[PDB]
Design a protein around this ligand. Structure first.
Ligand SMILES: CCCCCCCCCCCCCCCC(=O)OC[C@H](COP(=O)(O)OCCN)OC(=O)CCCCCCCCCCCCCCC
Ligand SMILES: CCCCCCCCCCCCCCCC(=O)OC[C@H](COP(=O)(O)OCCN)OC(=O)CCCCCCCCCCCCCCC
Lengths: 333, 299
């Protein structure tokens, strides 16, 4: 492909030189400006010929990102995958986004199966209360360390994070949590469906297509970090205030998360859409490992697709370690 | 002719430039980057290288314009558009041959927008400099060609007052304020922010957007850049007015919008001659602008 690109480019430059040559020969035939044009075109032709010979012969910010571990990838028989496969063929896998290509799967059916399996493994591993407690504490210190890195105070985030932790731990709020996400088109209420697909992955998607206004403000090389952040918080606060008006329940799941968004979104936007390579690289490492986690659990060659307990162990290992590497990347500065 | 030929080369270089944009591996990247560097250099070089008056406009199209506002002025047909418009163009430019009327209208528009920036408890000093800088620009006939190439580049047909000021700037402004980005609208209509908080946030956004737009201009001292200077200064006050929570400023904003629209409606109303309608269009214009500056002055 690249060879084809340069091949066509070589043809373009050759024709371009031919065009300039004709003009120069012509201009040569016929005032100071007339001679002036011939002089400039002459120089233009010289440079284009040199270039010809040479040919003949939201902005992502990269950051160190390479975490890997042992994987069980020696068998082709994966009853668990087949169970999801059969269920997928059965017609019991209703997705909300179908990120099959994002998960690098073969077809909707392979994604549909692997999803049904990943749903099971994640919720199964999160049956352990210690794992839920550890994961919450890790996400807290991770987002806190970042909000710290923007020279901000994460108290309000702690309040929203803790307020949200009490809601999900209290099972009496389960129906409302469903009524919310189901009203926003989410099908099941597992961790992946509500946390990964609905919140984070959509957030990484929303950060790739920001309004022309907000990004024009973030990428202003004449604004300090402080004024960038101050402007962003006002916008985010006013939008979440504007969205909170439309909610059917002011203490429901969407409102409880909007409280977290009001606090952590300003710092995250400033990271992804700012001009600081330090803050931007932190965001990319965070994004790259979260995406790599979703990529790893959707690979029969990285996790164990044979049983619930094997996959539950594997998906928890990948989740636990990816999040730690990010929290470390954040804690050390 | 030869100009078209060099224009053809410009297109070819532009396409090649984009195609080029699309240890040995690193070495090749450096080499192609150098090729792209040089290609852009020459690219830039190449770039540098009964109804009497109606009858006049009637069948005159047999009238190049930008937007068909046939409904905007509620006349019979598109062709009735071209006549009434061709007709309005002449009257405005003819009446604007008078230096006294040019001076009065400029003086009126100046104090009007200043009262606007004042209503936001702001200082219109920067606007005054931007307003004057362009007034010197349009008054100097040596900038006439550049003023064409700019507006000509944005699809404007004629260089009269109506085509550049009303059709191109004002009426476009009334439209863009009706479809604001989801972000800017939520901030202005935030009933929990003070007047100061809204204006300051709006100015930061507007200043940064115009910086992002100003980067794309072909002339940093051309007509469009001179207008962006006016926009950078008065637009924050105007946006906060139309989309804010103050009913005093909002009502003032609405009165201004209603007065300009009815003026455009009146000049496109038959119930004529070159001098007779030139007299008529100026009186309505003079009267509409005065009524607005007055209601602005008292508040
Ligand atoms: C970009 C970063 C964003 C960070 C902020 C937003 C995301 C985190 C905060 C919101 C958490 C929602 C929890 C409920 C979800 C749900 O409903 O999932 C249900 C899950 C799955 O088990 P189950 O309930 O199906 O088991 C039923 C058995 N019969 O179990 C829960 O109860 C939730 C478990 C997680 C609790 C939160 C832990 C801390 C936050 C996550 C850490 C990582 C942050 C994101 C990294 C990309
Ligand atoms: C939404 C509000 C926006 C406000 C800020 C932007 C608009 C106002 C400021 C910029 C003025 C541009 C002038 C060029 C226009 C043009 O092209 O008109 C061309 C006219 C007509 O003659 P001619 O040039 O065609 O003759 C060509 C012969 N060869 O003559 C001019 O030279 C312009 C005369 C007017 C000068 C400006 C008057 C003061 C500003 C307006 C105040 C009231 C508000 C507007 C009400 C409709």
């Amino acid at each position: 492909p690249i060879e084809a690109d340069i091949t066509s480019g070589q043809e373009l430059c050759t024709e371009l030189r031919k065009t300039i040559e004709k003009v120069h020969h012509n201009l040569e035939m016929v005032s100071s400006k007339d001679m002036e044009r011939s002089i400039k075109i002459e120089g233009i032709l010289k440079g284009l010929k040199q270039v010809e010979d040479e040919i003949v012969l939201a902005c992502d910010i990269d950051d160190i990102d390479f975490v890997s571990d042992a994987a069980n990838l020696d068998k082709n028989e994966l009853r668990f995958l087949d169970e999801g496969m059969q269920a997928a063929l059965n017609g019991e896998v209703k997705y909300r986004k179908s990120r099959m290509e994002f998960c690098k799967c073969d077809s909707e059916t392979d994604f549909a199966a692997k999803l049904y399996c990943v749903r099971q493994a994640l919720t199964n591993a999160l049956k352990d209360e210690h794992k839920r407690v550890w994961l919450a504490k890790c996400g807290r210190t991770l987002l806190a360390d970042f909000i710290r890195h923007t020279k901000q105070d994460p108290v309000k985030f702690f309040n929203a994070y803790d307020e949200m932790l009490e809601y999900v731990s209290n099972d009496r709020n389960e129906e409302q949590l469903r009524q919310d996400v189901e009203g926003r088109g989410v099908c099941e209420t597992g961790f992946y469906d509500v946390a990964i697909d609905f919140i984070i992955l959509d957030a990484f998607e929303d950060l790739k297509s920001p309004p022309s206004a907000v990004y024009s403000v973030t990428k202003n090389y004449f604004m300090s970090m402080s004024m960038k952040y101050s402007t962003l918080n006002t916008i985010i606060w006013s939008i979440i205030k504007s969205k909170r008006q439309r909610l059917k329940n002011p203490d429901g799941f969407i409102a409880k998360f909007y409280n977290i968004s009001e606090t952590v979104m300003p710092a995250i936007t400033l990271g992804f859409l700012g001009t600081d390579e330090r803050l931007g690289e932190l965001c990319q490492y965070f994004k790259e490992q979260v995406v790599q986690f979703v990529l790893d659990v959707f690979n029969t060659q990285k996790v164990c697709y044979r049983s619930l307990e094997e996959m539950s162990e594997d998906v928890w290992i990948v989740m636990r370690n990816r999040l730690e590497a990010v929290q470390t990347r954040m804690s050390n500065e």
